[PDB]
């Protein structure tokens, strides 16, 4: 419950989850324990932490649902590097064959982004308003430019902000391996 309040500080708010009835509660509790004989509560203490738990968990998924589209990006990287839909990637891979066949250059990067943006304006047009299309870029490796050109090319889904919380560093390195096969 203490981890979750820190994840909306990566969304940055000073809001106690959802309602301000959680705020009244802190004020109520401090007299209620103080007035008692010398006894602390503890069979009732675990009861309102349920009512705090369901509140901050559905809301921490709702603060993302307004703003970041987390689980929508869950479907999104899968169709662009887990090859989820073939009409998106054959029409990529067609337009990509005259550049991957030739030796890589020092100017290789500036054409591969451009055909990438016109690639998602030759099968897509309903995802411009979505940020799916503002969150893909071109990934190239350490491979020497004597190469054929194919092997070094891969697309990567660019992650930033509180969406990089769930898109940890260990994950997509393994997708890199799975993209290649």
């Amino acid at each position: 419950i203490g981890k979750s309040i820190n994840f909306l500080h990566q969304v940055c708010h000073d809001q106690t989850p959802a309602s301000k009835a959680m705020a009244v509660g802190k004020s109520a509790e401090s007299p209620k324990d103080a007035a008692e004989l010398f006894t602390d509560l503890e069979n009732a203490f675990q009861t309102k932490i349920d009512a705090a738990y369901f509140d901050t968990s559905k809301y921490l998924l709702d603060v993302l649902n307004k703003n970041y589209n987390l689980l929508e990006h869950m479907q999104a990287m899968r169709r662009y590097l887990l090859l989820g839909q073939g009409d998106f990637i054959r029409h990529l891979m067609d337009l990509l064959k005259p550049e991957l066949v030739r030796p890589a250059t020092t100017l290789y990067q500036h054409n591969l982004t451009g055909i990438l943006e016109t690639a998602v304006r030759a099968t897509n047009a309903q995802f411009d308003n979505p940020e799916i299309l503002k969150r893909l870029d071109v990934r190239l490796l350490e491979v020497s430019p004597g190469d054929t050109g194919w092997d070094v090319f891969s697309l990567d889904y660019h992650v930033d902000g509180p969406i990089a919380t769930v898109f940890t560093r260990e994950c997509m390195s393994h997708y890199l391996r799975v993209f290649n096969f």
Binding site: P17, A18, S19, A21, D55, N65, L71
Partner: protein, 371 residues
């Protein structure tokens, strides 16, 4: 307790205004909409969800089709009406109504077959412990610190003119007039078209309903106000909406409040606001008429103007007799005057045995609303 832990849901006629008691404005007000997808696919905009409701349906209104669960003030469909109650309690408040009593609103002219219907929804589905069904007319009167008078509800619904004598209304003086504020905002687009600026986007039409309350002003005597326009007075304001379309005011500034008294611009032979005021009092008992003249209250979102308070005062004597003291009580806020009366009622001492619970619901079913 319930002193601050009684929930005030004022289901108005186009906006649901939810909040906790002991405040003077609602927490969250927004227009009540639902949206139903036709074919489900890959979504766009906000994340996977079964229905875009409310303020996640007002952010995207060209990917969805809008349907008000509250249409002309009254619930037309009850399935989607539970869906906006679901939205007000858990998203735009967040508390479960099972430990906290609920104060919900009604129309002064809804049928009783409808009134047993809204009692069946709150007890069974939201499983509220207790609640009370309260008139919007009496709450707005209560924010104005009176208990008797007539309120001139002109909202985003049916105009009500409800004389209440000591918390009891006259069941032979509640006129249903078909002027709504939504009728005026719609009238305003089609006389903007005589200036040459026509809509074609739904988003530009949303700002027509804002401008109606915002830029537009009321002076006393419109008739000389158009006469002062012929000698070229200063009153013409030109709002700039970034794009080539303009919303100006100046020769349509005074016609649009003039349509309160004259429904002929809308093309009908119906009663005006002062007229429907005067017809309602003129069938009231002769002994309590005096108490209704001196406790005239403006309420609703249509009579949102800086200068409509005195216009109604100089205008209403010229109908009713002059051996009546008529005094127009005009609050500057009045959209929230139903809500401020609904919160203050939660903090009423004489209301802690006027609650309608599940136990009295268990002994007589949904006719416990008869009360």
């Amino acid at each position: 307790e319930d002193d601050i832990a009684a929930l005030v849901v004022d289901n108005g006629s186009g906006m649901c205004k939810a909040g906790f008691a002991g405040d003077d404005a609602p927490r969250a007000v927004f227009p009540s909409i639902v949206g139903r997808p036709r074919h489900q696919g890959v979504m766009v905009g906000m994340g996977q969800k079964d229905s875009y409701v409310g303020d996640e349906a007002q952010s995207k209104r060209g990917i969805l089709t809008l349907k008000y669960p509250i249409e002309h003030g009254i619930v037309t469909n009850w399935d989607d009406m539970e869906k906006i109650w679901h939205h007000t309690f858990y998203n735009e408040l967040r508390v479960a109504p099972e430990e906290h009593p609920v104060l919900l609103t009604e129309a002064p002219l809804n049928p009783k077959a409808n009134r047993e219907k809204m009692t069946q929804i709150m007890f069974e589905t939201f499983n509220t412990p207790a609640m009370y069904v309260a008139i919007q007319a009496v709450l707005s009167l209560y924010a104005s610190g009176r208990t008797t008078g007539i309120v001139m509800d002109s909202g985003d619904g049916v105009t009500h003119t409800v004389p209440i004598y000591e918390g009891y209304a006259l069941p032979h003086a509640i006129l249903r007039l078909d002027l709504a504020g939504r009728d005026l905002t719609d009238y305003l687009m089609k006389i903007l078209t005589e200036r040459g600026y026509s809509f074609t986007t739904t988003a530009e039409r949303e700002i027509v309903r804002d401008i109606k309350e915002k830029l537009c002003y009321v002076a006393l005597d419109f008739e000389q106000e158009m006469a002062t326009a012929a000698s070229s007075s200063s009153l013409e304001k030109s709002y700039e909406l970034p794009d080539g379309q303009v919303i100006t005011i100046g020769n349509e500034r005074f016609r649009c409040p003039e349509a309160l008294f004259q429904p002929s611009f809308l093309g009908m032979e119906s009663c005006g606001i002062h007229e429907t005021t005067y017809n309602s009092i003129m069938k009231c008992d002769v002994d309590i008429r005096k108490d209704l003249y001196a406790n005239t209250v403006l309420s609703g979102g249509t009579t949102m103007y800086p200068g409509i308070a005195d216009r109604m005062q100089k205008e209403i004597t010229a109908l009713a007799p002059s051996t009546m003291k008529i005094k127009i009580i005009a609050p500057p806020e009045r959209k929230y005057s139903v809500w401020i009366g609904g919160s203050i009622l939660a903090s009423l001492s004489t209301f802690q045995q006027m609650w309608i619970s599940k136990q009295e619901y268990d002994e007589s079913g949904p006719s416990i609303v008869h009360r």
